[PDB]
Symmetry: D2
Subunit: 272 residues, 4 copies
């Protein structure tokens, strides 16, 4: 039973391969900040030996109040990714919201992303399926792991067969998320063993980021999705919960130690 | 403490007023069927004395497989509502999916509707807010009743202040829904007491439709949302679960008996 | 399909019969209070025409701190029920905790009760099964409605076949309960259609008691379990949540109106 | 912030110390089997360098049908532990059900255990508190991690201050459990940092035992509770789910690798 491999350039994403890191920032506040963020990851990844795909949103459709920060915009956001690609030579992953946006971004970026709230949006899927680019399907919090087959299916049909599945927890009563560590294996199975990744920061709507990321890693995964900010405190708002830049490295040491140890275990069968 | 009233033409929707019925069919399969469905409700409502707003989808974006029935289409769907309005003189409620669709439909119909998966879609909201038409916000299964304030808010700002909230249950573990009968009062409160309605057929993803609708009604509500099909059996698929046309009346008798009895109770305070 | 009838003296408990009320107080604080409580229910029931079975605990095993009020005791509690029986001529229902207590109480009372935390306690069940007295099995919050067959089974074997099932909600995330109005029918079915009753006050760990009891009643049930206190405010603590004595009647009017209306509906089949 | 240490003989249980293993069998079917089970763990633990406390039930109160295997009995069960202690020189942990049983077992065994269904049983707690022996409080599936303070409290009062907390997952909808990897830290905090252990086999009511135990371990814990059977297949029934004896070692290698790596990480603070 070998794992499906979805490559992003010279990068090979797969469940038995060492874990890739799709780290980054939430939104593209400004390039002076993007660059500073994207500067530390690269430095840290490069130094620790971990694949990496910077991530950032150039848009935000679920914000409260219309009189709020939508974001840079598709036309001004893509421009920002350009400069980073050159200056740093790393891949960029970003999410889209409308069917049309799909192709524009596909050119500019390496891994596009499908939002959870829109996971079941056939039109936007088919249109993201056209691009042929790599996809990251965030697993909705209201959907069971064994239902991720349909999404992957609908994508094969659209001609796209390069998909990654991202988990960010499941609803646990009102206003709360719990991560079912058992969902990863269920997702690998029904997904022709596509690559599974854990969005730890979004599964925590704290000093919890670490313990929870350790647990995810010990299961053995293809990737780890995260977000950080130089100053989480003052810039705290809501949505996810970012990691403190200055703790990137010491935290990523924890992951590799795990991911490496685990990724190299003699296959076990507690089945019989 | 009086209830907010949102009128749809000569119709006054409100939590203390007698319940309105936003019944109908799931999708607009064909007019030969739409008309037959819309024929029985009208006949039954009219005969039993219950307000009514036919409902039907001219589109479907969450279907499995691209090679599937999208639906009539916006351009050919609106045409269908025209003929029904004339032939029957009843209001039409239908859902939209993209920001642009909003105005087109607003002209053609009386009550537009915001899908749950898109409840938090600011752009589509602002654009639905423009129309100024009545709105029905389906309460996502992954959102708590006391969070329906933000949606109603984002709509006031968009200039729209004619909103109804629809509940279709909450996630209960994997692949399952439970209706928190307590969510209705929580929703009335944080909603400036806007009208609350129960989507019974969508809260049941059976011979259960009735018992569950009774319970909802006994709480005292503004409306009741439902769907029926002449032959549920053979045309069964998935999504919701339709009621059997031939049982409309005897089932709606149950509701009025409840809604009427309850809607006329001396306000009670178990508070103290 | 007729309902199973479990009689408690001249009382006939059954799902299609008018609803019985197993009201009362939480614990037996003092007789000066018990009597006052038991005085108002009787007066109200008798005046409104509703069967009734006073209820009270002579013991409490889940209290915090050993240095707390256990309760009157089995030996001094039973004495209290005696005086009430005479003075008022009503039935008494109370819960037991240890295998031995079963018989003692069976003599003194009419309906014994099995605590949820102990629902799966075979020894205490078999011993409660011996008595042959009527039983009330509180449905644990961590057990699904369709699992109530085993308990009823284990009781038939013990020779006891006079059982009532009581529902007090289900776990909904951390520290929270939701009542699945659909659980009642599932419980009737797997229970040879035994009598199902709704413990509204324990399903609410407020001004919510009413709306929630209405919903339960509209489903159509055998009974309604509740608790009240003269002054809920000052004597508030935790466990359940009692109703305000002075609101008993106006609240029970709500129930009969429902229970009566519903209990006399032409059987409906939304099944086909 | 140092961890509380609860010693069981020459054994020191604590959250920062290497993990102890409280492995064993479910019930005491027969000594010819107990001994064979207890033979392999010891051999494996001893060879791998992991503390160990054989575990087995001499009783079963939640079985279906009275006409079923209760178990050896308290009087004939304790006798079995005697022979194992001598023959193998390992500690024995077993659960009690009635207040009286407490002392008898305390003499015979090292770590007694409080069942979840009885976690909130004040009498049985106070009586288990008397013994003064080490306690293992299984965390009920219907209780939140931050409520484990009360139990630990009620035990201090009873004079007992040597307690371990065991987690076996939380209710996730009907008939299902999910393990909230975040519950361990919440439990350490409100417990004066008492020792936390993960009951993996009971959190799985499969080939899942491993992945789930890895995740638990990566969080960093005091212990690991498990059960195994020579032939899980044919002797499969219900309650928990046992591990396959022949896979003990290769599975415990996985744990130590984790527990060791993790237990020796430079304290991290993703807090700021
Ligand atoms: O907190 C997050 O995980 C994140 O920042 C990561 C982004 O890559 C993206 O998935 C985003 C989110 O949900 C995208 O848009 P939405 O699903 O309509 O709110 O959340
Ligand atoms: O089963 C339903 O309740 C229904 O037929 C009613 C429609 O009015 C509409 O709310 C529809 C649904 O969810 C709209 O589209 P989607 O939320 O993206 O799947 O479901
Ligand atoms: O609040 C309650 O519903 C009540 O007062 C009713 C009593 O009849 C009894 O069921 C009691 C309870 O749980 C009995 O004891 P325990 O289950 O071990 O806490 O709760
Ligand atoms: O599957 C289990 O984890 C186990 O075998 C372990 C035993 O140590 C004990 O905790 C037992 C259980 O629940 C004790 O009795 P009960 O809580 O009344 O069913 O379950």
């Amino acid at each position: 039973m070998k794992q499906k491999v979805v490559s992003i350039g010279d990068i090979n994403v797969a469940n038995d391969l060492p874990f890739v890191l799709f780290g980054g920032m939430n939104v593209l506040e400004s390039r002076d900040l993007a660059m500073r963020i994207c500067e530390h990851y690269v430095t840290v990844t490069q130094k620790l030996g971990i694949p990496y795909v910077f991530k950032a949103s150039f848009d935000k459709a679920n914000r409260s109040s219309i009189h709020s920060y939508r974001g840079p915009g598709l036309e001004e956001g893509m421009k920002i990714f350009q400069e980073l690609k050159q200056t740093f030579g790393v891949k960029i992953i970003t999410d889209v919201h409308e069917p049309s946006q799909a192709q524009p971004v596909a050119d500019v970026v390496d891994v596009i992303q499908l939002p959870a709230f829109l996971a079941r949006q056939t039109d936007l899927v088919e249109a993201m399926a056209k691009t042929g680019a790599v996809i990251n399907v965030k697993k909705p919090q209201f959907v069971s792991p064994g239902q991720m087959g349909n999404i992957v299916d609908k994508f094969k049909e659209g001609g796209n067969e390069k998909v990654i599945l991202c988990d960010r927890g499941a609803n646990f009563g009102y206003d709360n998320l719990v991560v079912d560590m058992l969902g990863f294996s269920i997702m690998k199975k029904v997904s022709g063993n596509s690559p599974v990744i854990f969005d730890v920061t979004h599964a925590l709507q704290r000093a919890q980021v670490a313990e929870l990321a350790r647990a995810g890693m010990a299961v053995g995964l293809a990737g780890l999705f995260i977000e950080a900010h130089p100053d989480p405190e003052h810039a705290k708002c809501d949505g996810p919960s970012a990691l403190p830049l200055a703790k990137l490295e010491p935290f990523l040491k924890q992951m590799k130690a795990i991911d490496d140890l685990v990724k190299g275990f003699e296959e076990l069968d507690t089945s019989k």
